[PDB]
Symmetry: C3
Amino acid sequence: MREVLVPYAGVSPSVDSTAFIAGNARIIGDVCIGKNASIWYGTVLRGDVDKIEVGEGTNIQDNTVVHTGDTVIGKFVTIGHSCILHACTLGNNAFVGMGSIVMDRAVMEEGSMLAAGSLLTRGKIVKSGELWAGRPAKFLRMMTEEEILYLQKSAENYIALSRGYL
Amino acid sequence: MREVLVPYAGVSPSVDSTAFIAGNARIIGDVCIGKNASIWYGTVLRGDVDKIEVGEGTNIQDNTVVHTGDTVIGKFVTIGHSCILHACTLGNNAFVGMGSIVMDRAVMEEGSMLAAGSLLTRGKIVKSGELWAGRPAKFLRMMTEEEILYLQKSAENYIALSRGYL
Amino acid sequence: MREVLVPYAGVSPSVDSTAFIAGNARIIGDVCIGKNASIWYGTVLRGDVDKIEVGEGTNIQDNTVVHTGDTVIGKFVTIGHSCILHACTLGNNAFVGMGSIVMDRAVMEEGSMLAAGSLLTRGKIVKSGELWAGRPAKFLRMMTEEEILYLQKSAENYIALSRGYL
Ligand SMILES: [Mg+2]
Ligand SMILES: [Mg+2]
Ligand SMILES: [Mg+2]
């Protein structure tokens, strides 16, 4: 973790011992990583200018960049590969499809979803149970029962997956 | 390759000795890399949950993520920078434009192409000789003679390019 | 910098001593990096086939890939996270929004801007003072006074930010 955890302005990340951090991830400055979280290969959480909080049981998948107004990510959140997250707030069980961009001041409420490849623009609010999609992302429809159930299942799957590394 | 090749659940990648693997690439678990393939900087081939196969003479360019239903990539395939490939099948001489996302169960037939920045959604089939583009990607037109010739040329160029590293 | 700077065909990068280069960046071959530039985590500047020039005071943010017709990037340019730049020319004070793709032969004139998530296609010219957006990117509007001022401010902010690492 000597190469993985980087200080900025005297602040170093606080990482729960049960979190999985890929050896080539980079976590800089004011970043807190909760119990059973998993931060994947090539992910960059750059908390130099403002803070990043990552809740229990959250996965931030490969090559995602988080940087900024801080970034607050709740519990059991799934962030797909190669996302870009910028001073946003993601509620518990939020699901961000791979290849999505979430802009400054955007909010995903608890149990909401963004389709793969979405661009959620500044200040937009995805409400609980909603699926948004597109560029710029807009409300598409409510989620099905299967999709809602998958929010927690995805997070649990990733906790289990990450335990096969450590 | 000690840092580059990562075991998962007792399985480590099988890499042909003639393949180029960038020193900061990460290849995990059940992944097979063929003769003269080239896997570029910051690429992540994560074969933890299911297998990834990469055929002879294929290039997977920088910062691409492959992860999942397995991912089967044929021979002399070009995958551009910063793509995301998810349980898909790419036939020989398929060409995936940089910054594209290929979703679960999508298929590119032999000698087909996706434009840069495309989003090929679940289960869609790009037929041989076709060029698809957009988000969601849809049929645009057939490829020109020059474009069809370029499928093999791109792959050969990358084999030659990669030999200047090793 | 032993792992960061990579020779290709006998050519190694030329990096100003005042430039910040993240320890996991990869800079290959014919690449020149100017005074006070900053090249961020997971960025790949691959100057194997042709040259890459990066002017004074320019930031190229995390996980961006630059590769190709060469790539000429001027002074005090801001390139956002996870961009892909391909044989293009970016004038002084150009601003490329995060998650954008700039294709071969595209030009951004001095003091022009691309919105986040744009796809600037081959040979397109963004004129000074213009904001382009979309996929394919097209002229949206001229920039406001605040936006024009921000071009230089962004670059100065990044110089200052990078000095807290070195
Ligand atoms: Mg930023
Ligand atoms: Mg995946
Ligand atoms: Mg290229």
